[PDB]
Amino acid sequence: GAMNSSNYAELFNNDIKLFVDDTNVYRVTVHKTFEGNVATKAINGCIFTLNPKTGHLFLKIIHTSVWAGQKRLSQLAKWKTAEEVSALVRSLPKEEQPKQIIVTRKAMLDPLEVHMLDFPNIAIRPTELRLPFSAAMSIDKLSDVVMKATEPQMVLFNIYDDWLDRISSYTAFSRLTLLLRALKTNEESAKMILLSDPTITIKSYHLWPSFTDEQWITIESQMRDLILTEYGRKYNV
């Protein structure tokens, strides 16, 4: 069934599972044409496929050439996502194939289900959580690799850097989702909070700064304050 607040700890048991988020697969700029009509220009996108227990991220870059000469691209985007996810699963050894795939948007269920018919024992699940994975292109290194790509390309990251060396998956996922939630609601402020101090650097093989434990506590409090501030502003509360 659906994933919600109640069965939230299942993300961190030892059943292999992947989140799939398609929000950044088909990305466009909207502009005016010489004649004053509106047109879109696609830019590169990505499928964000993430093991929430281990941090392993499978970032499938979607090159604009995928769209060439195709109609109804927003619909096609869902099927391309499902195709790529299915191929990822086929590429993985049996003992690494997920037992579940949780799609962040219900519109991916039928596309993935159809693409996964060869894997009847992999369960395709929706979620009621309002996960902030669209904000993944707010992570500078992920955005840079997507925008520089010249061809379809799969790039592998650990989205938790080395945090699991010191904290649990549950805590790591909570940190990740707080950071991304903050980046979604107010990117400029979120990013200011993360880089303000130039003595805290990002390792070449990491996505986030090498905060100490105490500095992560200050950071997380700053991110929480940001999110609450923006809420009051949005709703005048």
Next chain:
Amino acid sequence: MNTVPFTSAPIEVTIGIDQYSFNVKENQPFHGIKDIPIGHVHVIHFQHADNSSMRYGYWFDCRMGNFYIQYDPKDGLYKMMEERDGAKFENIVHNFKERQMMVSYPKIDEDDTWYNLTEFVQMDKIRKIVRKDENQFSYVDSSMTTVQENELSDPAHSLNYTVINFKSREAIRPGHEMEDFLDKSYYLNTVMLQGIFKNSSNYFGELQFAFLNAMFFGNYGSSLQWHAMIELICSSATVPKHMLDKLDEILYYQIKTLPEQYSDILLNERVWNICLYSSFQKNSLHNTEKIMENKYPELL
């Protein structure tokens, strides 16, 4: 014109013959139905005055034998049987007519309803869906489940409709995932018509039989099956023109005949709104669309 005599009527029962029905009282001198039109299948069905649960009945074709009804007080139901002694059977039928203890199949001459509802229904195909090869007629009731229902428990009592499943390997060619799911033409025309049903008539026959079982017995799995076969056609971009025109006629008479009070449970809102208004074939069911809008605009 053929006859189905009844040995007696021991329990109060509503008797249906095709789209007609009569109330018969406990131990009323009722002894059968006459003037049944040769050339079509027919269904005789029952609903006991005491158990408005379990409607049941028998599909038959009088060209295939002499059939009669006899109440069984052990099993507590009106049973169809075959009389193999043609002479003994003409003798019963004549004596009962002479005493005028038989109702007349009450067909209006202008009325093609039953033909229109059963055009492609063929007794030999019914007997493959309802498998009971020692009888030439077929029992169906309210509670019988279909093979597909059984997959998601007694196989002897199952409705062996053709399994249709839009998210199956059968339905979806590898490498044409998105195409085949959005445009079911290959599932309809290659897999189902050319492969399994062999022709559109057998397909329409199963579709009409499923409808009639849902209507007459409130058989839920038949209703699922009827909607599935409709949807498969409406969700195919490439359908022979002769099948669309015939489908419009089939559906029109099914919608026309359905009891108004049952439109809630018998008509799947999603399917019908998708077939009439979203599907490739939205524009191809003009009579069915017109009757649906004028009779059940709520559902839409």
